[PDB]
Amino acid sequence: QALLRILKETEFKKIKVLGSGAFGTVYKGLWIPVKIPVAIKELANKEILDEAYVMASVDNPHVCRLLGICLTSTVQLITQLMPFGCLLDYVREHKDNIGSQYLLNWCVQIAKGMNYLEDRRLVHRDLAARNVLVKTPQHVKITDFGLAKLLGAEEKKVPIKWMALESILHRIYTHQSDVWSYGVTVWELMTFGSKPYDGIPASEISSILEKGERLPQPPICTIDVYMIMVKCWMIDADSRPKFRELIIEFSKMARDPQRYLVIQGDERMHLPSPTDSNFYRALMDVVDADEYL
């Protein structure tokens, strides 16, 4: 009945590699406590477990939950597999079939998730489109929260181009610095996955921000939507929107989406279902974690 399950190595299997780089490697696999499709991230134990418990205790439709942990020579984190992958890749791949309704609903959902994390007094520290996952095209969930602090990023690689200026200069992380990163995430979605400050070295970012330069208005965005982003990047952290306010504003916009985003052929767009999705098939072709719990 443990909220954070301690898994023996024999209780899970890595089947294929999903992704790799800095922070480790994530595999697609099965948890066999019945067979449950999972992602497995392979990156003091007493402290690591304390932090992992918080990640296992979250219960919100827009926040991923840790299902289990395996502590050996490495730390392995086990979570439900999200069969459509990350939202960044998703928007890059489906840029010709993503309409205004979907983009605005994703903004709402991410804000709901982050508001929930704020209620849990949990600062994410690494919100980005790569860290939002697609359960279905209509339902996204935030992941990878609290790794930054568990690793020790408040002390002594950092995602500079998503960080609030106070995080860069003074390693200050708050729910308001998460609002800045939220702004960058929304910008990533509205540009269908452009790289922020592309071609500009990370070492120059603080000076650029101090000069008042920001990410440019996405072609599809009305000024109303861009102003939300710009407000997320104000130097005065206390003046940035709160996630509660962002839920309200984007929910209002989602009720009349074509007023707020101007997308060529918005009306006639269609995203692949599980049966038609190459990606879903690539992953899946016996019991979903939700059904198991």
Ligand X SMILES: CC(C)(O)CC(=O)NCCn1ccc2ncnc(Nc3ccc(Oc4cccc(C(F)(F)F)c4)c(Cl)c3)c21
Nearer to ligand X, 53 or 216 (CB): 53
| DSSP of 60-114 | BTTB--EEEEEESSSEEEEEE--TT-BHHHHHHHSTTS--HHHHHHHHHHHHHHH
Nearer to ligand X, 44 or 267 (CB): 44
Site track 146-185 with ligand X (rule: CB under 6 A), x = hit = xx--------------------------------------
For ligand X, which residue of 4, 7, 55, 110 counts as binding (CB under 6 A)? 55
**Is 41 annotated to bind ligand?**
yes
Residue that is written with structure tokens 């929304």 in the block: 186
**Is 76 annotated to bind ligand?**
no
Measured in degrees and rounded to the nearest 5, phi and psi for residue 79 equal -145, 165
Measured in degrees and rounded to the nearest 5, phi and psi for residue 89 equal -60, -40
**Is 250 annotated to bind ligand?**
no
Task: Report strand pairing: 132-136 vs 12-21.
Answer: unpaired
**What residues numbered 5-34 form the site for ligand X, per CB under 6 A?**
18-19, 26
Considering the complex, what minimum distance in angstroms separates the CB of residue 65 from ligand X?
5
The answer to whether 35 touches 287, Cβ cutoff 8 Å, is yes
**CA angle at 236 for the pair 234 and 239, rounded to the nearest 5°:** 80
According to the binding rule CB under 6 A, does residue 64 interact with ligand X?
yes
Considering the complex, what minimum distance in angstroms separates the CB of residue 72 from ligand X?
15
According to the binding rule CB under 6 A, does residue 132 interact with ligand X?
no
The answer to whether 53 touches 146, Cβ cutoff 8 Å, is no
Scanning 141-149, 178-186, 220-228, 237-245 for contacts with ligand X by CB under 6 A, the matching segment is: 141-149
Is 126 among the catalytic positions?
yes
**Is 79 annotated to bind ligand?**
yes
Using alpha carbons, select from 27, 26, 24 the residue that is nearest to residue 16. 27
Task: Please list the residues that pair with 12 across neighbouring strands.
Answer: 31
Residue ranges of the binding site for ATP: 18-26, 41, 79-80, 144
Query: Where on the chain is the footprint of ligand X (CB under 6 A)?
Result: 18-19, 26, 39, 41, 55, 64-66, 77, 79, 81-82, 85-86, 130-131, 133, 143-147
